[PDB]
Amino acid sequence: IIDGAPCARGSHPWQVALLSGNQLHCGGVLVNERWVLTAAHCKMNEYTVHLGSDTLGDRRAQRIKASKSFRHPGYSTQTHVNDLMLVKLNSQARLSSMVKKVRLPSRCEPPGTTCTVSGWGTTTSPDVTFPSDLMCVDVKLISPQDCTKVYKDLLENSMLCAGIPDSKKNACNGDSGGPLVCRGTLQGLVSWGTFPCGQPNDPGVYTQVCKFTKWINDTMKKHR
């Protein structure tokens, strides 16, 4: 997260991290006791999921292996359209005040809405600074018309853009697959943006969760 600050402790119980070799790979969100929602770009054969602490490296956190995952079949590594994946935990997440399911959206929040994006991704770019504590930043939803001025026909209608005018506030490498929450619901998953990160007036691009409700529920049901 670029130009953010540490999240208030205990305010992101639905936030998870996907680890590989005890290093941060991606962010993610807890959907229910058995499932984690993340970006399809985060695909791996095996995952170690960190849950229940704002601090990566915290002995208090749960560490659950996940051997199965399912990318949306429409996912393209070329254009990043349909960038979402469900990760099946090997054992159930043990719920508490620090581990809770996210609230999935019923509706799509409009342009101009204030949201919060969170993650353990680098706080600097191109030079990397990976934090221990979970970082937060507030951004506003940007209309597809305004976002098209930057990214042209690379943008699809199931992608959601967010940022702050003339501001570096944004997500970066390591935050991928993590949550963008607006008015109490999960509206986006961190997907892509410009590189170096935090470039003013280059919006962050997210998978628009409200467009994928059916697939998310059907996939969990089928692979239960």
Ligand SMILES: *Cc1ccc2oc(=O)c(C(=O)O)cc2c1
């Ligand atoms: C989209 C995506 C896939 C895998 C990634 O692995 C990583 O380790 C990072 C990072 O900067 O921690 C980002 C990734 C993004």
